[PDB]
């Protein structure tokens, strides 16, 4: 609002039989300037939950140190009882609504996901506090562009294997490379399964510029 | 912030203005009479912006007066009302919005008496009784309570004195005298001014 | 706003070979009702009524302007006006004064003058033809007159059922509004009659 | 500089019969021109006999249901007695008013039934003004559903139809047709209304789809 | 939006990126900001999109009518002159930082710059557009003197590759066009043809 | 109010949803957005609902005056340039994000016209808000030089992907297929949105009215 | 909203309409716009539907605390005064209300008028509301102190009948109250249409 | 937009308010008396913002009344005037500007009668005659033309009737009744209210 | 205002230009935007001027007190961490895009970037300032991998020479500082020492 904040663009994710996969590009765009290339926007927390960020990255470093400190703090009480991704979603919701309630708001708009004891989870937490659950999410312009490819396949079959979901978000991330202006080539794809959180970065997009030479 | 009132009788229509020419803080000479004499049987009234009342409605008086003393007969008040609605409505949005709101008392011979009404946007409507200004907001229910559709002349005059004594009592502006004219099938008459 | 100045609310709906156009007889400033009789349903043909809403100086201005160009059109070429053509003519009356437009949304209700196939149309401020075979809605209290009259209208209705449903749609629509209502008016246009009627409403 | 409200949309309805209260809902929360999700309920089961509907800004609707839920629990074992319905309406009136100067931009409707058993429904502006009714949907298609069940429930502007009291079959068929009509005509439609319906023996919850666009 | 044009020797070598962003959405992934106006003289276009090609076909009209009126091929200074006039007189309504090039038979390689305010200067290399601020160091450091056609071809190619790599409002394929005596020899660089540069990691 | 169009080996396939929503309420549930200009050129329309109408009546009328002045069939380049130059000099006050396509003596091709007057030759275009809901389905499953039937299925899947997750959605898809020899302007292609049904009759007969004054007037 | 109140030789009539707008769309046709703070006084509401409802609700709390604390019926000037104190110390915060505080006490019929600016005046008659000056006109034409009970009721019914007829932001029903030395009673719940057919 | 007036005699000072409690468009009950009773011999008047007149000056009445019925004797009007100037002047800029302008008639026993004056900024000055409101702008020259420094009581009352009949004639607000109180060496004595 | 800092090997090589403009007037032709904070860790400063050195001596206070509290030389990650905190908490009042460097004994060469919004990333080369937008092409193209001290010395030298040549709010002498194990070896480039590049003439 006051300055050209350092942003990202999109953390798009989909759940699948198994776990949930979220993906984001590593980009530190300083207002139409890719000032920071190798910049991870995918936070790992305790072994059954993940976390992204789309908006301001400085507020995401604030959230990675308060989420990190909170989850190690309640992690070292022993007695089992780690955070289900219920509680990271709800705590992040109350943190942001209690943050805009004093008009000093966090500006990033993330999606947290994770595989709980029974089934997976993919929840959206907005800049304003608009929080919900969905079978497939996308943030920023991905919510305009990756979101149709996600809620087309999932209206046909709401059941995905891991390779179908992984190729699905790779293809959607290629679409955001094609259309979104604040988007960069390489991206981290990141999946939480029964065996836990793992982050496979960075990847690339096989570009298709074969329609270019038909312009006159 | 002035005050215009009219009541349509069965064979007449009477209008009354407030006889106060205002200023920033003070009032000027009272009389300044707002009711502009039309041809013989039409009579319009004008308040609003101080400087468009004496300008626009006198120009309408020029054109209707030219119509009568150009082609013999005069206008019916319907054609005069739609005439000045046309002229204000097309002088509205162009370059200089004439901010006046008109009453137009009148009668034709072979139809009834008519009291036309329009805002400063020149939206015209017939009315059995109409009002204007801020004083319209409190006095109009007394013409709701007592106005029969058929009313004699002196009953309408003392009803009009009820409206002016209420307007004298509650409304915050000093409006002590009111100019009253009954027009009917013998031409424009003028009732004695109501003072306090 | 400026559309909420004089209130006003017209609609039109058709079943069988009749249509039904309906207005609310009310005119005044935002809080004040300076009169009850106010012409909003302007006849143009024998069986083609145009109904207007919004700012009252624009509904009399393009009502009389449309009677000018319409009347001169049927004088230049002797026949009753085909109503699709009149839709095109108000479409090129509200437009071409696009900059500083007229603040009205005229609906057009009626019959083809030789085949008696009914239709009803609606336009926006700057003039866009919405041809409609169900019902059209104009005025301040739009979505009530939607909403409810989309919840009432069945297809292929004779004039007494259409009579009854536009009566209920108008009364319960404008009752749930502040700046509209206080006695409404319904014109039924059959292929032989104009059942013109008023309706005692919640006049408050 | 920030605009701390958006309008996430949604229209919720409640009807008070004589032993029931049909608290309808919709599903699609959405702002700007893109929809977010199609699962989201808006009728929340407060007690066994009170159901709220809650439409408007969704985050503040959500926090408001957390506050009225947690303070219902704060009541219930401070007096060893559950809430009534009118007391829910009163304390939600003072919760909505208590933050006036940065208000809860939310249109919420509290259905449920009274102490004696007859159903009641309390309507609210976003700053808090409760009236008990037998209808009044609220929030996005407020001015669309209202004139139908001003007529098909209140029987206003309507002569001698010999009007009967409502029931769980006439009013059941009166909620689905108004939401397919508003599914046609509103933009903030909903694709599957989840009618939290309240009765004397308990509570059930019927769901049926809509125009999905 | 990034444009390069380098006068090598005899003729010139153009170059333009290809995006048309509506703020933060690429409305046209594949556009040619290179455009011919007569035969040899090409104008490029930057800044806005709607005004600058109204200027481009307006000066195709005026330059074509003038060239057929003289029965001679016109100079590039002619086209840049009526770019100075046509862009200068409407300077408060147009965002058109066009930089033009071509081979007149009289002089040789000419590259003129008509920036956003609207004027005319002659330059050896020209540069202009949104991303054309991120490569003044590289173009200022690498361009030596009197280079040839293949090394200005790859010079414009990797300069525009830097500018499309770093700007967010610039990307896609890049179009080169080498105006010379024997006509234009244009081509595109389709994906792998872009000289991709390595990004420094671990960090 | 999403709009799309795809070029293919024989021709082009336009397509639009049919709903016009003033404010946040649908004013009309079935309107043609695929406007005639010419027997070989159909345009489209988005943005202001009236400005697209008037700009394509003007370019339709002026263009077919031009074509019967030349005698031959009108080309699609001159429609692009008349929409460009006439839509530019009103400084973008006309909001008409329309696309237009045509089969011509040169080749079947389409253009997009942004409301400020910027034109783009493209193989595939999307105007309106539903652009975003219908561009991604031109980026996973679009192939150049493709046959007519899965291009029709492609554009129906694009507009159908602008139906289901946009609030400028439409009732039903209509799409035109402009080929070399035949034109196929087909109104609605698929209707994925039924009305539903009502439950229970409502009215009496000659009741449920507060009649104050009747008036009957014969005509013939 | 158009309220109205006037005192005479037998207590004071308080009448009001029953509609509650939301700018132009209207919410309810039946709103209890007279708050019964105890069975000896009343209190009206004239805009800002949660403001006025909250502050006469809270006035009912404070006056009941006065009833418990000093074991007397509260004087009406005390209730109007403390209302003017609290809504005075929220002046300028966008607060907008206005009310009668009528009710018999040990000195008089009462009828104070307290609004958002903090006027807090006594009166013989008032009518606060949106339009409401219509009510002033018609009420002050038929008002006298020497009225009996029935044409006072007809003065209120005709008064805010015309004030709901001419105004747009009013109507619905009319409730009417006649408080005297026993407490308030209710004499009406008539709507506008039955008054229209009742009085032509 | 109300009206306060005062005239200092040789052994008295008389004040008169306008007896009109206004509103947006209408006037409420006339009486509402603006002159607030101080201890025995002081008498202040207050107009300005509707809601700070009844609040601030009554609080001053509380503190001065507490001073008299705390420490025996009452204040001289000098100390009461500088007291309320201090309280308004330090309640001026802080959080809630009390927008009232005061007259303060009074007299001490062993000094003359005093009529203090202040604006809404609490700048205090003695005056042999002072006025307030918009009605101050036209009536103050009549107290310039006729006011001798030594004037009898009935001459000052009929002079005050000259000022009120001029204020009745030219000033545009309906101010029909005026409340008059003469204070002098026997205590606060009030003359019959002037009406028209 | 243009700052460079390149991690070569083992240690780092800083670099900063020298102007302090009051819009369109060089108020200080010769300033050192390089400044020490402890011994090896240097912070630079860009953007505004008044706030950023209040941050610099504030973290000289906190970092010096912490370093004497541990009796160990502190990491560069410590100083960049309290730059993230000290600049993040006051983010709506400060224009301080500082990029810092130094040699901790534990890790080695570290160069962190704390941009205008206030955060912390680790980079091989960092860059920041007013003119530090005109040389992303040159620095992006020339910096290869694992360079040595003399070629990062001349690399930072001619990169800052490009940025002072093209920006109007950047110029004067440039200051280099090569943090290593044996301490800082700083120098200036006085006029002719600037690698002047030829301008093409049209």
PDB file of N, CA and C in Angstrom, chain C residues 202, chain G residues 16-18 29 157 171-176 186-195 198-199:
ATOM      1  N   UNK C 202     -51.543  -1.017  -1.048  1.00  0.00           N
ATOM      2  CA  UNK C 202     -51.134  -0.470   0.233  1.00  0.00           C
ATOM      3  C   UNK C 202     -50.658   0.947  -0.026  1.00  0.00           C
TER       4      UNK C 202
ATOM      5  N   UNK G  16     -47.046   6.189  16.932  1.00  0.00           N
ATOM      6  CA  UNK G  16     -45.940   6.014  16.003  1.00  0.00           C
ATOM      7  C   UNK G  16     -46.387   5.088  14.889  1.00  0.00           C
ATOM      8  N   UNK G  17     -45.618   5.080  13.812  1.00  0.00           N
ATOM      9  CA  UNK G  17     -45.877   4.195  12.687  1.00  0.00           C
ATOM     10  C   UNK G  17     -45.154   2.866  12.918  1.00  0.00           C
ATOM     11  N   UNK G  18     -45.023   2.034  11.879  1.00  0.00           N
ATOM     12  CA  UNK G  18     -44.419   0.725  12.095  1.00  0.00           C
ATOM     13  C   UNK G  18     -43.494   0.250  10.977  1.00  0.00           C
ATOM     14  N   UNK G  29     -42.915  -4.238   8.145  1.00  0.00           N
ATOM     15  CA  UNK G  29     -44.140  -3.463   8.213  1.00  0.00           C
ATOM     16  C   UNK G  29     -44.724  -3.415   9.612  1.00  0.00           C
ATOM     17  N   UNK G 157     -54.568   9.516  15.222  1.00  0.00           N
ATOM     18  CA  UNK G 157     -54.766   8.632  14.078  1.00  0.00           C
ATOM     19  C   UNK G 157     -54.818   9.409  12.773  1.00  0.00           C
ATOM     20  N   UNK G 171     -45.406   4.513   7.391  1.00  0.00           N
ATOM     21  CA  UNK G 171     -46.615   3.770   7.098  1.00  0.00           C
ATOM     22  C   UNK G 171     -46.771   2.525   7.934  1.00  0.00           C
ATOM     23  N   UNK G 172     -47.256   1.460   7.314  1.00  0.00           N
ATOM     24  CA  UNK G 172     -47.395   0.205   8.015  1.00  0.00           C
ATOM     25  C   UNK G 172     -48.618   0.206   8.898  1.00  0.00           C
ATOM     26  N   UNK G 173     -48.409   0.328  10.197  1.00  0.00           N
ATOM     27  CA  UNK G 173     -49.495   0.357  11.156  1.00  0.00           C
ATOM     28  C   UNK G 173     -49.421   1.644  11.965  1.00  0.00           C
ATOM     29  N   UNK G 174     -50.304   1.754  12.951  1.00  0.00           N
ATOM     30  CA  UNK G 174     -50.220   2.796  13.966  1.00  0.00           C
ATOM     31  C   UNK G 174     -50.602   2.193  15.311  1.00  0.00           C
ATOM     32  N   UNK G 175     -49.671   2.225  16.249  1.00  0.00           N
ATOM     33  CA  UNK G 175     -49.958   1.939  17.640  1.00  0.00           C
ATOM     34  C   UNK G 175     -50.090   3.245  18.407  1.00  0.00           C
ATOM     35  N   UNK G 176     -50.896   3.218  19.460  1.00  0.00           N
ATOM     36  CA  UNK G 176     -51.200   4.457  20.144  1.00  0.00           C
ATOM     37  C   UNK G 176     -51.254   4.172  21.633  1.00  0.00           C
ATOM     38  N   UNK G 186     -52.549   0.314  25.745  1.00  0.00           N
ATOM     39  CA  UNK G 186     -52.573   0.244  24.294  1.00  0.00           C
ATOM     40  C   UNK G 186     -54.006   0.337  23.807  1.00  0.00           C
ATOM     41  N   UNK G 187     -54.245   1.204  22.830  1.00  0.00           N
ATOM     42  CA  UNK G 187     -55.589   1.400  22.306  1.00  0.00           C
ATOM     43  C   UNK G 187     -55.712   1.069  20.830  1.00  0.00           C
ATOM     44  N   UNK G 188     -54.624   0.738  20.141  1.00  0.00           N
ATOM     45  CA  UNK G 188     -54.724   0.523  18.707  1.00  0.00           C
ATOM     46  C   UNK G 188     -53.604  -0.376  18.225  1.00  0.00           C
ATOM     47  N   UNK G 189     -53.905  -1.101  17.151  1.00  0.00           N
ATOM     48  CA  UNK G 189     -52.892  -1.690  16.288  1.00  0.00           C
ATOM     49  C   UNK G 189     -53.320  -1.592  14.833  1.00  0.00           C
ATOM     50  N   UNK G 190     -54.057  -0.539  14.486  1.00  0.00           N
ATOM     51  CA  UNK G 190     -54.643  -0.415  13.162  1.00  0.00           C
ATOM     52  C   UNK G 190     -53.574  -0.127  12.122  1.00  0.00           C
ATOM     53  N   UNK G 191     -53.816  -0.578  10.899  1.00  0.00           N
ATOM     54  CA  UNK G 191     -52.923  -0.266   9.800  1.00  0.00           C
ATOM     55  C   UNK G 191     -53.448   0.936   9.026  1.00  0.00           C
ATOM     56  N   UNK G 192     -52.739   1.285   7.956  1.00  0.00           N
ATOM     57  CA  UNK G 192     -53.057   2.499   7.215  1.00  0.00           C
ATOM     58  C   UNK G 192     -54.284   2.285   6.337  1.00  0.00           C
ATOM     59  N   UNK G 193     -54.453   1.072   5.807  1.00  0.00           N
ATOM     60  CA  UNK G 193     -55.531   0.824   4.854  1.00  0.00           C
ATOM     61  C   UNK G 193     -56.900   0.841   5.527  1.00  0.00           C
ATOM     62  N   UNK G 194     -56.999   0.291   6.739  1.00  0.00           N
ATOM     63  CA  UNK G 194     -58.276   0.309   7.444  1.00  0.00           C
ATOM     64  C   UNK G 194     -58.615   1.701   7.952  1.00  0.00           C
ATOM     65  N   UNK G 195     -57.604   2.529   8.209  1.00  0.00           N
ATOM     66  CA  UNK G 195     -57.877   3.935   8.461  1.00  0.00           C
ATOM     67  C   UNK G 195     -58.323   4.642   7.195  1.00  0.00           C
ATOM     68  N   UNK G 198     -61.763   3.629   6.699  1.00  0.00           N
ATOM     69  CA  UNK G 198     -62.541   4.116   7.830  1.00  0.00           C
ATOM     70  C   UNK G 198     -62.888   5.585   7.663  1.00  0.00           C
ATOM     71  N   UNK G 199     -61.986   6.358   7.072  1.00  0.00           N
ATOM     72  CA  UNK G 199     -62.141   7.802   7.019  1.00  0.00           C
ATOM     73  C   UNK G 199     -62.233   8.343   5.604  1.00  0.00           C
TER      74      UNK G 199
END
